Design a binder for this molecule. Structure first.
Ligand SMILES: *[C@@H]1O[C@H](CO)[C@@H](O)[C@H](O)[C@H]1NC(C)=O
Ligand SMILES: *[C@@H]1O[C@H](CO)[C@@H](O)[C@H](O)[C@H]1NC(C)=O
Ligand SMILES: *[C@@H]1O[C@H](CO)[C@@H](O)[C@H](O)[C@H]1NC(C)=O
Ligand SMILES: *[C@@H]1O[C@H](CO)[C@@H](O)[C@H](O)[C@H]1NC(C)=O
Ligand SMILES: *[C@@H]1O[C@H](CO)[C@@H](O)[C@H](O)[C@H]1NC(C)=O
Lengths: 111, 1028, 105
């Protein structure tokens, strides 16, 4: 309902797959009128980048390794293989009718 | 188990190019042939067997006595990493195999040592079981190895000609680059084939017995040009020439940025169609492959410029118009469209357009509840102009609340519907076609300026070839280039240096060969039309010349005239009568200097003069009689063409299309018949001027004058006289053929013409001058001649006093014309000319049939037998249009030639009337001297006249006086002149010296001794004195 | 595709003001879509308004937009201000950089 963002964990074993999830309240129509869900990656360093929107369209730099999905009010991000560099905080956010509210993000570590 | 000189080819290597029987003909063709006198490498096994390059075709030959050469291996890598073919005669049969063979480094045939194993075989064939020159041709084309063979007994590279025959067309599928021989455990030769043109000569049994290598030298080229193995004499134009460009001058503007296409095609937000937006692209490199070689687009359609051509072009500006429409609107974004979007929201010009690009946005712009952010207009008081926007939103009133509407509608874009209702992003790229210095160019590299020489060039999208030179033109700062009267660039501003360069064409012109006949010598000189020979010579040595011949050179015999330059003719500082004209006052000829072709200044005539005096006269004291021969055409061949047979012979489909050209076919048949008809009118008007037939007398010697060679001989099988028989002996189409051409017979046959001619000579020989005027008179020949002398102004008595000499000169003159006519080749050149032109016109008409005029075939049955009617009609109509022009051209040219023939016939008819049927008094019409008589003779296609001419001979000088003084009176001569002879004054005739006593009865009185300037005192004889 | 460049870090004592600005590597006239996001010290991202909009924040933050020269000024600068914002481009791929203002005694 409020984008808490699932707990800050995933398997940290290198080379293994992972799934990151979030929760909201409704079909999320965007101020431009389209349904939207946004996935951003906050690197451990200087800045965020946009990965996926509306669990379907993927942005340059992450079309082969990352994939969006979900149903109802429960949405996810799939990482095909968590390939060593895939660290940082992955956020699901309401880039919709809602006033750009972000959850806590999922902390990703690889060990 | 594997173990791991140069000769002149002469005229060898001709092979039959096809499987078609031909005979009695010269066939021209282009194929890979061994060039004549090419270089062929000698190898010996006495063991030179390296890998030898194939170069797309090999001439291989060997001389044998012990079966040393067994075969060949053709391939590339000569190992098992690539396909290769082994062709071996194993003394049993011929074995051909194509495989990735494990070939030997040191092979032989004894044990067979060619290969150890074989893999991935594509072809295998075993043939039937089986001092010497064996010749082979190995040609490679489309996966096939074409092999020709032949044989000649030898004793040794032998010189000669040996036509080779085909043996194999092997479907091997191998890309062959080199080869080796297979030798037995001899000598051989290898040459290379080239795509030269040959003229092949077939004998009466269809064997090729000779040939011309069309590129060997300028004479060989001439032999192809006129389709002959022999040339007679003169200037023959055979081709043209040009200088081939050396470097490439490419100059693009200093544009280093990259065009922002993402900003046009990948933007998050697009405008609605009623309110579309435009953005400008400038000062950048446009790689257009980014929009083209990866598909996102459902629509990628360009007008004017194909999409693939965009990277080669520069534009002044590029503009991108963008908007969102539905799928059923995308089709309206085009030139020539109507509809709500095309008419009220976005109008394109009905002019060249750049590119209209579009893609589906169902998952971007459409929504599950309906996206209503996109709008379009449906109500407007009028349509938009190209690229006009009208975003006004005011109430619309159809009549200028009931019937008050808002002009905008919307697009309810949903994700639940089909394609015609899905949203599309449409981008239109407008390219401005270089109206200002380019700002947008493709990813090209530039080069430097190569000046004052023939180069290829490319400036900022402007291309061509030529010579770039700096110039004085002063362009305005906004002008990039200029043009001459024709639509061609005259000069261009350089995009990096801003200098102005004029563009001259590269040198070119016609090529003609000066030649004596080939019966004298195969020596020629070449004339290059309208060029500076500095460049011609340079292009020959620095070979950049086309055409150029393989065995040809430029010597020191090079000079230039206004007619172009000659190479090979020796300039001389003398002069002579013109033999073969070059032009601009200079002629070529073949003379001894050991002979050579020389170029000399024309002589105008003999340099001689006559002294001027105020008191003298020259008077001929003797004379001679000679006979002049004059030749002129009267008629030409009466050709006829069957229009339908020529164009649509035996074709229903063609004939039905031919009918759509209406009256054309009938008019051709009619016009040509009309021409043929006038050929009989001309013949009749020239010869049938005889009122009645006159008979040939039994006596042919009248007064000493022998007419037996002019008149028909009653003891011969013919009715022609000796001279006429000689004229006739001295000088495709049906007479049916498939081409519809034929030649019709004349109305008046050869016997009728000879009969008229004989009646006319026989008659004027005894009829006097009234032969064709009224009743014939019976006049002794000698008197008739006396009157013809009297008619010149020579006193009548001269004929009788000198009758023996006059008759003897006449006879001799007849023998002289027979000798001249009998042994020469040029006397009847005018009649040969009308014959040759007929043949050339018909040969041209027939050759045109083989042109396909763009059709798949020249033969209607090669279209119809393998093509559906719909396409066949396309191919047939193309072929018909061409043939209609061929026939129309033929008739038109035949028609103007007919007019020239009529003019000649009219002259002949006039001449018959004034020279034969009477005595002409006009100057230089019936001969060069004074006219006496003439005799027509029958000739093929024309008339030959013999004119009997009186010519004054040796003259004597006399002192003269215009008048004489006698007893105070001024006496003048009545007919003659006064002359001073051995110490006495006499009166004479101007054309013949026969002095008479000056008397009162051969003079008259006018005025007196004090009023005439330049007179003398004299005595005038008065007969009265002795009577007194 | 489109990158943004924004000013670097700054240090102020409470009071007075600081200004922040950025620019886009674009051409012609695309509009708006120059947004700002705050990253509080250990919390998630916070929206600071779309251009020139105002939402769940105070009057200290003042919006202006021209090459997309975008501005967001902070009047009456206070201690609760660190990693104050990132410029976010809303075009094509969408993109962020980040600045920093530290306020201390
Ligand atoms: C070709 O071979 C002949 C004979 O050895 C020689 O005279 C001529 O110079 C050679 N020409 C070429 C093409 O090099
Ligand atoms: C040889 O190379 C040509 C390239 O022009 C190709 O078209 C052809 O298929 C090749 N054929 C064989 C037998 O390798
Ligand atoms: C053509 O064949 C005939 C009959 O064999 C022969 O007499 C004649 O010489 C041949 N002519 C050629 C081969 O030119
Ligand atoms: C944007 O970049 C180019 C624009 O032609 C092309 O790859 C595609 O349209 C877009 N790619 C994405 C979706 O990142
Ligand atoms: C005329 O000349 C021919 C030879 O051309 C001769 O045979 C004939 O006897 C001559 N007759 C005469 C003298 O009339």
């Amino acid at each position: 309902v409020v984008m808490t963002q699932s707990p800050l964990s995933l398997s940290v074993t290198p080379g293994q797959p992972a799934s990151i999830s979030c929760k909201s309240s409704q079909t999320l129509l965007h101020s431009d009128g389209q349904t939207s869900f946004y996935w951003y990656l906050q690197k451990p360093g200087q800045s965020p980048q946009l990965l996926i929107y509306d669990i379907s369209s993927r942005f340059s730099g992450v079309p082969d390794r990352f994939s969006g999905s979900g149903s109802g009010t429960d949405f996810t991000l799939k990482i095909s293989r968590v390939e060593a560099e895939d660290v940082g905080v992955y956020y699901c956010m309401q880039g919709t009718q809602f006033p750009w509210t972000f959850g806590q993000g999922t902390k990703v570590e690889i060990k | 188990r594997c173990t791991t000189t140069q000769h002149t080819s002469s005229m060898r290597g001709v092979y039959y190019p096809d499987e078609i029987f031909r005979s009695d003909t010269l066939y021209l063709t282009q194929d890979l042939f061994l060039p004549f006198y090419s270089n062929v490498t000698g190898f010996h096994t006495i063991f030179g067997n390296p890998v030898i390059p194939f170069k797309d075709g090999i001439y291989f030959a060997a001389t044998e006595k012990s079966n040393v050469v067994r075969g060949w291996v053709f391939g590339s890598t000569m190992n098992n990493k690539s396909q290769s073919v082994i062709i071996i005669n194993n003394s049993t049969n011929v074995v051909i195999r194509a495989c990735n063979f494990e070939l030997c480094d040191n092979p032989f045939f004894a044990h067979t040592m060619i290969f150890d194993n074989a893999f991935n075989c594509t072809f295998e064939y075993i043939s039937d079981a089986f001092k010497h020159l064996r010749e082979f041709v190995f040609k490679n084309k489309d996966g096939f190895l074409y092999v020709y063979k032949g044989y000649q007994p030898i004793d040794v590279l032998p010189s000669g000609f040996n036509t080779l025959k085909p043996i194999f067309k092997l479907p091997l599928g191998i890309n062959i680059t080199n080869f080796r021989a297979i030798l037995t455990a001899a000598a051989y030769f290898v040459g290379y084939l080239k795509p030269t043109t040959f003229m092949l000569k077939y004998d009466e049994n269809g064997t090729i017995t000779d040939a011309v290598d069309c590129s060997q030298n300028p004479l060989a080229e001439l032999k192809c040009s006129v389709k002959s193995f022999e040339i007679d004499k003169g200037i023959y134009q055979t081709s043209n020439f040009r200088v081939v460009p050396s470097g490439d001058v490419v100059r693009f503007p200093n544009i280093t940025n990259l065009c922002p296409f993402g900003e046009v095609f990948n933007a998050t937000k697009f405008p609605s169609v009623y309110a579309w937006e435009r953005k400008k692209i400038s000062n950048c490199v446009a790689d257009y492959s980014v929009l083209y070689n990866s598909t996102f687009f459902s629509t990628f359609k360009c007008y004017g410029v194909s999409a693939t051509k965009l990277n080669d072009l520069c534009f002044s500006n590029v503009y991108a118009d963008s908007f969102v429409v539905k799928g059923d609107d995308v089709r309206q974004i085009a030139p020539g469209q109507t509809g709500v979007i095309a008419d009220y929201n976005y109008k394109l010009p009905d002019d060249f357009m750049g590119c209209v690009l579009a893609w589906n946005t169902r998952n971007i712009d459409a929504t599950s509840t309906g996206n209503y952010n996109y709008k379009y207009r449906y109500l407007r008081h009028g349509k938009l102009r190209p690229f006009e926007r009208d975003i006004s939103n005011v109430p619309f009133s159809p009549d200028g609340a009931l019937n008050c509407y808002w002009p905008l509608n919307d697009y309810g874009f949903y994700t639940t519907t089909g394609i015609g209702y899905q949203p599309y992003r449409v981008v239109v790229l407008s390219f401005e076609l270089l109206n200002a210095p380019a700002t947008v160019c493709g990813p090209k590299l530039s080069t430097d300026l190569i000046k004052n020489q023939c180069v290829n060039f490319n400036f900022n999208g402007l291309t061509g070839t030529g010579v770039l030179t700096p110039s004085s033109k002063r362009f305005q700062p906004f002008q990039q280039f200029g043009r001459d009267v024709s639509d061609f660039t005259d000069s261009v501003r350089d995009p990096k240096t801003s200098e102005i360069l004029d563009i001259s064409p590269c040198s070119f012109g016609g090529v003609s060969v000066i030649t004596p006949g080939t019966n004298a010598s195969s020596e020629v000189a070449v004339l290059y039309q309208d060029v500076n020979c500095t460049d011609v010579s340079t292009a020959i040595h620095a070979d950049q010349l086309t055409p150029a011949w393989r065995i040809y050179s430029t010597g020191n015999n090079v000079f230039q005239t206004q007619a172009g330059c000659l190479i090979g003719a020796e300039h001389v500082d003398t002069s002579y009568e013109c033999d073969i004209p070059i032009g601009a006052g200079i002629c070529a000829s073949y003379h001894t200097v050991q002979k050579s072709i020389v170029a000399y200044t024309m002589s105008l005539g003999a340099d001689s003069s006559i002294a001027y005096s105020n008191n003298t006269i020259a008077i001929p004291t003797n004379f001679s009689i000679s006979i002049t021969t004059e030749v002129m055409p009267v008629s030409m061949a009466k050709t006829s063409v069957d229009c339908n047979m020529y164009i649509c012979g035996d074709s229903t489909e063609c004939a039905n299309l031919l009918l759509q050209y209406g009256s054309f076919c009938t008019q051709l048949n009619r016009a040509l018949s009309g021409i043929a008809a006038e050929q009989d009118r001309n013949t009749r008007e020239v010869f049938a001027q005889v009122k009645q037939m006159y008979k040939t007398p039994t006596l042919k010697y009248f007064g000493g004058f022998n007419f037996s060679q002019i008149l028909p001989d009653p003891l011969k099988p013919t009715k022609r006289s000796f001279i006429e028989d000689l004229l006739f002996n001295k000088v495709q189409y049906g007479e049916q053929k498939f081409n519809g051409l034929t030649v019709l017979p004349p109305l008046l046959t050869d016997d009728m013409i000879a009969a008229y001619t004989a009646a006319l000579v026989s008659g004027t020989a005894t009829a006097g001058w009234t032969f064709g005027a009224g009743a014939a008179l019976q006049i002794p020949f000698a008197m008739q001649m006396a009157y013809r002398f009297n008619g010149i102004g020579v006193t009548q008595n001269v004929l009788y006093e000198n009758q023996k000499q006059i008759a003897n000169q006449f006879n001799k003159a007849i023998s002289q014309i027979q000798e001249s006519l009998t042994t020469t080749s040029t006397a009847l050149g005018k009649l040969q000319d009308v014959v040759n032109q007929n043949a050339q016109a018909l040969n041209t008409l027939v050759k045109q049939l083989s042109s396909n005029f763009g059709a798949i075939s020249s033969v209607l049955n090669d279209i119809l037998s393998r093509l559906d009617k719909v396409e066949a009609e396309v191919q047939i109509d193309r072929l018909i249009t061409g043939r209609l022009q061929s026939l129309q051209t033929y008739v038109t040219q035949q028609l103007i030639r007919a007019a020239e023939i009529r003019a000649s016939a009219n002259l002949a008819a006039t001449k018959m009337s004034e020279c034969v049927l009477g005595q002409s008094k006009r100057v230089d019409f019936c001969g060069k001297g004074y006219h006496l008589m003439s005799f027509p003779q029958a000739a093929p296609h024309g008339v030959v006249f013999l004119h009997v001419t009186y010519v004054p001979s040796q003259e004597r000088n006399f002192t003269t006086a215009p008048a004489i003084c006698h007893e105070g009176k001024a006496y003048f001569p009545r007919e003659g002149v006064f002359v001073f002879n051995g110490t006495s004054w006499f009166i004479t005739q101007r054309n013949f010296f026969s002095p008479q006593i000056i008397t009162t009865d051969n003079t008259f009185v006018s005025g007196n001794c004090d009023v005439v300037i330049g007179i003398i005192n004299n005595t005038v004889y008065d007969p009265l004195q002795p009577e007194l | 595709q489109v990158q943004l460049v924004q000013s670097g870090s700054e240090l102020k004592k409470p009071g007075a003001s600081v200004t922040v600005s950025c620019k886009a590597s674009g051409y012609s006239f695309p509009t708006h879509a120059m947004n700002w996001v705050r990253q509080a010290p250990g919390q998630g991202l916070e929206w600071m308004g779309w251009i020139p909009t105002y939402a769940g924040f105070t009057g200290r933050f003042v919006f202006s937009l021209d090459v997309s020269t975008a501005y967001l000024q902070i009047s009456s600068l206070k201690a609760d201000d660190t990693a104050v914002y990132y410029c976010a481009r809303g075009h094509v791929l969408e993109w962020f950089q980040g600045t920093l203002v530290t306020v201390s005694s």
